[model samples]
Target: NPSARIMTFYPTMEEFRNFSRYIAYIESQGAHRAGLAKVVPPKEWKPRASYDDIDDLVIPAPIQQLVTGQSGLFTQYNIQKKAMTVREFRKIANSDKYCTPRYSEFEELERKYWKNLTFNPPIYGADVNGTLYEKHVDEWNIGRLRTILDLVEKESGITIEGVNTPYLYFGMWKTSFAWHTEDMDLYSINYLHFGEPKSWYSVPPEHGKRLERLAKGFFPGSAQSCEAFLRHKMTLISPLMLKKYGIPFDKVTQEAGEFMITFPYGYHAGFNHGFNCAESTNFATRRWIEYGKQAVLCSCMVKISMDVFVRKFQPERYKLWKAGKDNTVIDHTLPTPEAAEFL
Candidate 1:
């Protein structure tokens, strides 16, 4: 039997603080070949405050009902909006009734029963609207990177939630996300604040098309109805099936204090092992400019135009760098020695 493999890096607080440089080093090691990489910060790293009030905070979460078959597929009609505290959702997620069975049992049940199952919903995207790290101005602030070096930050007068601004995610047992790429093919980073692990699977950028083709073959009706059906984020496929189709991929179990980085065009999907809170946002570097330029629009409109980005943003970015106002490296153009000297 064949299996996917993911590379993990352990970075010190110093190395992790220099985000761009360390990520470029990860790229140099060919971790992008897996389409995703995991980073575990040094053990001594800790947040300034835990903000325990989050558990008691109530919010309306959109819940999705899924069927066991067709790779856990669901439709827009399956969603139901409900209000619940974070602690209440955690109780439901930890219920034994929703416990994940072994792979064989899961496959058998899906094939034989094809039953509807309700799992705790993911608190994602604009649902949260803002981040919880507003008060914390230290190194552990995962939301800081996007504000500084992300190319989208160069654009004027707008904040794109979950892109330029981070989105907080609350996940519980079996709460999952379907495979998809970032908007405008940008890079994305997800950091788990605390709780149970999240299992992630990803296909490298080169194999993204093959995965899409396979997905279309499985859901021809969806493909016929919408050209970019994958953008719906309604389809989930088991790793066993992906392996059967010989689509190259890798997997990782993300624990607390770990960050997962997905490269441009990387197709990734996963389910939470248990209750967890995570934060994620999309970002872009100079290398992503071409991808954004060539990207086709989906049903959801893209926020920024590549034309304006090139015409207006790049020059301003260069000006800031030259003036010694910004120390972040936005691209791979500079050699290691020059980058070190420039910084």
Candidate 2:
């Protein structure tokens, strides 16, 4: 089945709150699917990237913790149990014919690497704050999802920040993430700020159970074996391929300034359509808290630590939501004391 919805326009705080709790409109026939939305950006906005600056972009060292800056290599993340150096990863990211190489070698590979380049926080380089539609935190309804979770902070005196804020993403034609859901069942919003388009493939939330059954069946003992879990990779099947195999999903092509949303528990996966830069972050609403609680239980059965649980979900927060308490869900001006406490 298809999943996700598309929309345009920056939501007024009221509109933003409403979207957090409701479902988006679904189109009929033709482009029918619940996943992937090609959102509209503000008309006044223009691309903030300078292709010329790509070469001089100083990629920060080794790529972790401080996830920003331009370097000559795409040396980040655990790919195949080994971390690649900037030079090594650069080669793989560039060797592929489809993605090939562009601009300078490092610039080419760097563009293909998704991690280590985030904008919302100015993780590195010149601050691209001006590039964002909501320049001031006050204008961000994106952070409002954290409100209900904050109630847990006050209730139990333990706090957590639900998701990573906007991430700066640069991906080339085959740069991709495997089939997955947002962490802790949160919703992620992706905006293709500049460059080439990105293609996406996603399974609807309704199909999650069947998808899990298929994954377990395909992977054999993956349900119980850790090695099997790591080795049993999720195939990023295109819609046509899925149809050929009798599986169906929704697909979309995201162009510059178009926003893509990954809803709660929504399974999504995709690759860069060509070369594109996007900014993304996570948010949650009252509904997400229950799922977060459910996830914590699932995590425990799988041996995920309670400390990590306290660190992320903030059990107290979920409890507050269950008890029908209200919390400040949309105030961006305050320095996130919750994040500070967690860090």
Candidate 3:
């Protein structure tokens, strides 16, 4: 019955305006120990644009169909990708017939009985960058928190998706993101622009391995199929089940105008309560370099050059050099020449 602790912060307009400093302040308060933190901005804070302004915009979306198994456990798999207009998505999301069944209702249903039920798979317009952000820079810029990624981009002139640019996410009930860490196990921030709350479940970085081990046991077939199955972003496990196995996790209900920050190596997943739009991006700070190195050692895909760290923060150069001396087991699979230089 132990739930993970979620640090919540209520920042003043002045503090909120200085995004990076505020995040640092939270981290200094041991926010990273919880792995996830929530920031409630001042009531007066408002974005320049709203979802209503882009109702007719057509975007690529992924639709996932629900599959109920003999064990009475249901999982969703991506069925197809399609072009969907915002208005069309909103209509489907608001439909009563398509509403996601409550956990209690879903749990009570007999596996055989629910097999005949008709349902529309939830569609998500995730990872939408460029056009949407370009069309509404003012609104998007407000949530573009500064991090070490910005320094890397500025120093190296490299644009990393979900780091240099923000991705817009459109979700309705049951539209979920499975358990995974950010690229390179860096930090991430997500801002809910509008609509219903998002339910988040997160494991502290310390317990990330424990969660992974249990998840692998839950889906051994997937583990056997792919080495990094979680990266596929298709898995979903209920928090109730996680607790039953003695895994520690925290839950948060993120409402409109709120921000959620995930610390390095924190395993997080969530689903929308109803129709909602969110913007998110990966970021990093000097503190994350060690975690990034661990991610590289673990063979996670790393898109940034390790030299970018040295170029931007010379002080970290010695730490990287020392790490190399301490651990000679370098991952040769890393694509960046900088990895070789650092190792």
Q: Which candidate has the top score in TM-score?
A: 3
lDDT of 1: 0.66
User: lDDT by residue for model 1 over 1-343, one digit each (tens)?
Assistant: 1212467999877887777777667776666567788988888876536757788766566465453454534432245557777777667666675544445633443432223333333332114544666565566465677423354456555667777777777776556787888888778888887887777889877777889899888889888887677777777776767888988887677888788988777789876765778888876655666556555456535547565555544665555544556545323222222134234
Which regions of candidate 1 are displaced past 4 Å?
A: 1-5, 71-78, 99-126, 146-154, 312-343
CA shift at 183, candidate 2, in angstroms? 0.8
In order of appearance, the predictions have TM-scores of: 0.78, 0.56, 0.80
Better of 1 and 3 by lDDT: 3
The digit string of per-residue lDDT tens for model 2 on 209-271 reads: 555665555546546654223222234333443555554566566778666766555667665
lDDT of each candidate versus the true structure: 0.66, 0.45, 0.68
User: Which residue pairs does candidate 3 place in steric collision?
Assistant: none
- List the candidate numbers ranked by lDDT, top first: 3, 1, 2
Report the C-alpha displacement of residue 179, candidate 1, in angstroms.
0.9
Ten residues in a row with the worst lDDT in model 2? 120-129
lDDT of 3 by residue, 1-343 (tens): 2324888999887777766667667776667766789988788767644455798776675565554443323455666677888888888888885555555532342221234222556677777764334434332252355566777667767777666687788888767777888877888888888888787888877787787888689789877777666766656666667778888888778898888988887789877777888888887766676566557332334467665675555554557565675353432112222223223
Each candidate's clash count: 0, 11, 0
Judging by lDDT, tell me the better candidate of 1 and 2. Answer: 1
